[PDB]
């Protein structure tokens, strides 16, 4: 089995937090190549893309800050 | 059945947009049936402006949460 | 040859842009064949709008997928 640290633990916590966000974005892109002017399609596109953007930014910032605490506390060993 | 906060906001707008989109067609076909009056043209114009302004409100109410949450992420450290 | 996660996203819309170029070129040609109707002018605005919408949507896709990980690589440390 692949390993997972606390950083990987929180990253996986976000990844399992969003159920089908990646697939939803991909299918929004796929349908946006066919019927783009559709309101119920284009609005959902932009909404879910913004949600995906914030999800990725939250993942990166959370893992970076947790690495920051880890580095700061580990610097105090010596 | 996922619907995040941005999707939650869009939910309050999709049901309004659908009604306007269904009634603008009912205005257009009526106008095509009897275009001899200007009152029906004004009604169709008002319905179209209704649809487009509500759509624009939906368009802007999402980019205004975009930067709020982005600024939260910037100070999220 | 090589194609990253942005090249394929751009090419996803390329299947419709070529179609719409062909269609708009035929629209101009048939307008030149006979211009005495507003139906063709209306179709012209219907099609140029779809063109601008495809192009702007593709630009938005590539921009947002640039910014999705520009920030992640900014704090890549």
């Amino acid at each position: 089995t692949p390993w997972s640290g606390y950083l990987d633990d929180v990253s996986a916590k976000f990844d399992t937090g969003v159920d089908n966000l990646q697939t939803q974005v991909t299918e929004a892109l796929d349908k946006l190549a066919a019927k783009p002017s559709d309101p119920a399609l284009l609005a959902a596109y932009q909404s879910k893309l913004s949600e995906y953007n914030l999800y990725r930014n939250a993942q990166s910032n959370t893992v970076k800050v947790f690495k920051d605490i880890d580095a700061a506390i580990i610097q105090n060993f010596r | 059945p996922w619907s995040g906060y941005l999707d939650d906001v869009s939910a309050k707008f999709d049901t309004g947009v659908d009604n306007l989109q269904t009634q603008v067609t009912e205005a257009l076909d009526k106008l095509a049936a009897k275009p001899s009056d200007p009152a029906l043209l004004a009604a169709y114009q008002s319905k179209l402006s209704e649809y487009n302004l509500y759509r624009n409100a939906q368009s802007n109410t999402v980019k205004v949460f975009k930067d709020i949450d982005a600024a939260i992420i910037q100070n999220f450290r | 040859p090589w194609s990253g996660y942005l090249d394929d996203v751009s090419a996803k819309f390329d299947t419709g842009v070529d179609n719409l170029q062909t269609q708009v070129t035929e629209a101009l040609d048939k307008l030149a064949a006979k211009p005495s109707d507003p139906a063709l002018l209306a179709a012209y605005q219907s099609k140029l709008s779809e063109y601008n919408l495809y192009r702007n949507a593709q630009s938005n896709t590539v921009k947002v997928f640039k910014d999705i990980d520009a920030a992640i690589i900014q704090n890549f440390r």
Binding site: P39, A40 | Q21, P35 | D37, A39, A42, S46
Partner: peptide, 19 residues
């Protein structure tokens, strides 16, 4: 329920009254 078809109906009804 989409917008390409409403553009199509506009481009069609602008001619449906021409003749």
């Amino acid at each position: 329920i989409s917008d390409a078809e409403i553009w199509d109906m506009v481009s069609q009804n602008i001619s449906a009254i021409g003749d």
